[PDB]
Symmetry: D2
Subunit: 334 residues, 4 copies
């Protein structure tokens, strides 16, 4: 995109926007336009360089860029929510959560690499429909994964498979030991994004906040793998369910996108004479009531528990959530 | 009772048997279901549901399912191109020179084959899939990767819930249908164009017609060959359509080609031919496409059903001039 | 006929815990899974009940059996045949008499028949360490088990093979879910947590007035079915010594081959797979003590006292092997 | 790290057997027993060392052995004919044919590697039944490959797929251009092994013989890829059909195996109520007539043409073929 070794006017504007990668509330949609619809590539690249992950894991730059573009190319541009913009956002969000004071120096570079790589592939090749819809139509995807976390298993499978395309193996220089460890952590994290796992994921997290233990600096202390992976699973899970905690201006865009996607599934289900899934009926919808419900039963209980784990780090995020809830509350038409 | 969108749609569907159907218009009016609507319309028109005892619901379900597997984000190789090739083949099947030459099964094969010939097309060429070591290319050994895939997906989609539209055909019919469909779709791979055309010419030079001018086809070989070229012509019929339609196709294919070029540029790959938006020649390209591929093909087909395709050759030669006089200097 | 007079005679034990499966494999021409599944389907009148054409059932069974590897010493068609017949008997246990619908009975038996289809003779960890296509497809999670399910269902799609063609949509979805639930439960890594939940059920155990076990909701009925097939899969040590020793030789042969493969490859040799540092005897006793017995003891406490003659046979076979531990 | 790729205390007896690696009639069955059923791994290792392919293409020793073991592991031990022994034999036979005087210095190292690799993977994961059988039972395999060269397309896919297992990428150090060339040549060679392409192949070979050209040296002239790949295809095709041209003792063993595999398909076809395939009915078998017919209508016509192409290099191969043909003839019950 440059000319004579100097940034283009667009690149410069993009570079200036990217300066907020370490802040909750990055203008992720602005970055998607500026990057020519390459939010996931540019943001992952910026984060890998910010964290010096290329040197640490000897990842050639071109291989990194080639894989990222290939990964992004596999997110469907025609899907309203579960696309490359959602992935870029979950990546950036995870990146911010990883740098929380309460977790400073808690994770190794490899665990950090896993949290981020997992965030980047967690919804790749999402068809824009739920597991249940895939299950009810006897799709081969459902047949292949025995109707269990179909999409999630698929996202993982594809994320790894793309490492094999020409000059795409960003892990070519890791030892078998590192790769097996990285791989197990990424799998554990992504499978934990299947909402059907939510309740139990939160139950275990609350419990961890009970036996919780720290140091004289308030920094968390995680004994073994079981505790460290649990924090990472919930971290990415929070990032995936962070739309409601973002400045309303961003949140509203996420709401329109998820509803647009749900409504498309409802239309397809109606055409096919299937029962219209919950919240996927544009003729009997309550965008405001549903967002309030989403917040009261899932998002608030999750972030509240997280804010507790890293208290008081996630206070502003928690305040924003509660504020956005009241805003949606006051919007319900009587 | 009316419902406007319905009157305007059903009205447009009235041209289903005519070369020049306003397919883009039908796509809009049907809420983006041109393949479902047109296939179904055509299936009724030819009385196909009754002949092969295809339950309506199963057909509609399979059609929407198939249509759902064409990519909405692909400018050219999407559900609209599929619908067009289907309808274009439906017209070519009714040409006088072939009157009553094909059985109902063979008619079903040419149409189903047209419906799935490009399903799940990613918007990029075989060579791009090969050069990047895509899972698809490795699976098909770099040979007609996409075409093999289209077949595989088209058939596979029959196994989804209430999607087996051939559930009442016999093992004999299913076997015969499968083989014909496979032969037809694999023939759409452009790398096989030159040979297909040559082999077609040799057939015209043995054109064993009747007293009415109706072609004669004995063995499966002659038969399948006409079906392969028929579908091949349908697939390559954009230029022979009313200028207003042809122009939309041209804009669509270029959008897709340029998108591939941008992809290839991003990856540092050599930009494929006619895929560089910075070094384009839309007008010059189209003219060349017509002279070296489309016209040579259509002149041969019209030479097999003479004079059934005169208006087709005329519209072609006309658009050929329109784009030509559009060449800057 | 000179053969079936012997076979059919041997097949008269289908309902007894100790059938001579090996001899049956001989007499049937290495078709124990096809034969035994056939008998059991007639015995329970499953063909007429679900309107399964005879030709279709047999074609599928043969197709299914053909996908069990003849070169694998343990995880072959004989293990499959045996787990089927064993699940068959466990379903007739008094404490469960008339507790399961025919669909459920179908699911349990079908799940048993396909539970190990296309087993390569090596463990999930081996497929994982080698970056095999199977492990990459299933994200190193219950790799073999997911595969067994996929192939089992997939083979229904072959010529004249859909034995569930005449089931209603509801029956198909129900069966499908249950078969998956069962087979995924046979992954030994799920053992500990599957037994813990079985015991928690043994405590709050409740029966009907007729005595027969009272199975409330789906969660309770599937969990009982999961553990049942799991018991059938780990039944070898509870059978008569003669049979049991044949299984030990077979499992050890398969394990040693895997060990030899890991050695040629400079891979760490898996536990009990090193033929140069073997302990066939101590291992069977340890297998019986820390896994098999605890499982069959919790099952005894569930269908008490139905699983009595079996549990004693287990405790005896242990003594025998222990008396063979060198030192 | 052992001497012949695998460990064996019979190493001395194995070494003596492997001395004939460059000779037609190597005791392949004997080598299989001595290598612990690793004839493919041992023979490929020996050939790569002799041709110096590891050095030329920077193939790490351990990567090659791991791949060969993996590849050999995917030939089925329960299949009597299409197993690792047949693959080892075809590899070795192709190796001898590549060394024929009439072809000296004609092929590049890359083309030699392609011919040998293609021979090694040409029948991998063979089920022991024909393409026709897989097509008539609606096998998943036939569906994936639209009933066209089902087995052959699969042999190629598996052979290439296995390069992705841990430490199995023997082509990791080849440039992109080399990898594409090799891949195209291997695909072209293996697909030509489908017997349904036999007549076109032969007819084409005869044509080339008709206008055959030799250089200033006594070697064949091949300009374009088209003439080059054609010779390689016929060469491997000849190796695949070389059983009848080997010392009778070896030939008869091959005959028993193929018949055993054919009858197996025969029994399976009758169990399922299928029409038994030709030469698969153990109840109506004429093993001797069949071998004679096989030699008269397929093998001899092919080797006769190959002999002319490399005249007089394969004169003894042809002489043995005729001696063996008479042996089977005098074995025909009357
Ligand atoms: C901010 O919007 C949302 C953002 C993200 C999600 C996740 C994506 N898919 C899910 O099931 C949860 C749901 C949302 O809203 C849903 C809750 C109520 C209606 C839709
Ligand atoms: C309407 O034009 C076109 C319409 C359709 C096609 C087919 C789609 N892919 C192919 O390879 C042929 C090409 C066209 O023109 C191309 C040739 C020159 C420029 C683009
Ligand atoms: C009859 O023996 C056995 C029978 C069955 C099994 C199951 C099959 N695969 C498993 O992982 C468990 C293990 C046996 O013995 C093993 C335990 C110690 C050595 C081998
Ligand atoms: C050693 O003989 C044979 C050796 C090799 C083959 C090839 C392997 N598979 C084929 O289809 C051909 C066939 C043989 O003989 C067959 C032809 C007549 C009877 C069997
Ligand atoms: Zn998701
Ligand atoms: Zn997500
Ligand atoms: Zn196409
Ligand atoms: Zn097309
Ligand atoms: Zn198992
Ligand atoms: Zn088992
Ligand atoms: Zn072959
Ligand atoms: Zn072969």
């Amino acid at each position: 995109i440059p000319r004579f070794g100097v940034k283009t006017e667009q690149e410069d504007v993009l570079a200036k926007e990217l300066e907020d990668v370490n802040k909750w509330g990055l203008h992720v949609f602005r970055i998607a336009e500026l990057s020519g619809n390459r939010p996931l590539t540019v943001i992952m690249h910026t984060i890998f360089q910010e964290r010096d992950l290329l040197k640490t894991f000897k990842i050639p730059v071109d291989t990194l860029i080639t894989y990222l573009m290939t990964l992004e190319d596999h997110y469907h541009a025609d899907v309203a929510y579960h696309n490359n913009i959602h992935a870029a956002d979950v990546v950036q969000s995870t990146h911010v959560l990883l740098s929380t004071p309460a977790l400073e120096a808690v994770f190794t570079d490899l665990e950090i690499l896993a949290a981020i790589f997992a965030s980047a592939i967690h919804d790749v090749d999402h068809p824009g429909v739920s597991n249940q819809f895939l299950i009810n139509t006897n799709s081969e995807l459902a047949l292949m994964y025995n109707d269990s976390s179909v999409l999630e298993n698929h996202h993982l499978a594809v994320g790894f498979k793309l490492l094999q395309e020409e000059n795409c193996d960003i892990f070519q220089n890791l030892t078998k030991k590192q790769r097996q460890s990285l791989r197990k952590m990424v799998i554990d994290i992504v499978l934990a994004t299947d909402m059907s796992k939510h309740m139990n994921l939160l139950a275990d997290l609350k419990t961890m906040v009970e036996t919780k233990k720290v140091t004289s600096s308030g920094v968390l202390l995680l004994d073994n793998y079981s505790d460290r992976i649990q924090v990472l699973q919930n971290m990415v899970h929070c990032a995936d369910l962070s739309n409601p905690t973002k400045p309303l201006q961003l949140y509203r865009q996420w709401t329109d996108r998820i509803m647009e996607e749900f409504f498309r599934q409802g239309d397809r289900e109606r055409e096919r004479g299937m029962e219209i899934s919950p919240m996927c009926d544009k003729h009997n919808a309550s965008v405001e009531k549903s967002q309030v419900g989403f917040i009261d039963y899932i998002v608030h209980p999750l972030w509240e528990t997280w804010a507790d784990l890293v208290h008081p780090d996630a206070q502003d995020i928690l305040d924003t959530l509660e504020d956005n809830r009241e805003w949606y509350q006051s919007t319900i038409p009587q």
